[PDB]
Amino acid sequence: RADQLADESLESTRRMLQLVEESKDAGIRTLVMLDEQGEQLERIEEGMDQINKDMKEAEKNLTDLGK
């Protein structure tokens, strides 16, 4: 019944094909999401820097004017 063993090997090959391609397809989109994340991070960083500079300059100018 070694031919039955070979047939089991063939169906195992089918399962390998399905699982491998499925994982591949999921991962590609994983990549696209991780790209979108990096795009957004730059904008949030820039906004933070601008707010920091504006707040610092404004508050220090007001404090100096208070004198």
Binding site: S12, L19, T30, Q37, L41, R43, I51
Partner: protein, 68 residues
């Protein structure tokens, strides 16, 4: 030949197990990444709103000082 095919049987079992594990790993990864993305969106909204509010705040405060 017989020992070779027995080793290849061990190999097929191991390959099945590993593939399965990768399958689970990937799905978990996906889920977690999506959650992170949502939280990033909300924080970006809040930060931009704060930026606008503080800008108009400083503008109005300096104009009020000018009134003095």
């Amino acid at each position: 030949a017989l020992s070779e095919i027995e080793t290849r049987h061990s190999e097929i079992i191991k390959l099945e197990n590993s593939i399965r594990e990768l399958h689970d790993m990937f799905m978990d990864m996906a889920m977690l990444v999506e959650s992170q993305g949502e939280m990033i969106d909300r924080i970006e909204y809040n930060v931009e709103h704060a930026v606008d509010y503080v800008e108009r705040a400083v503008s109005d405060t300096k104009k009020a000082v000018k009134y003095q």
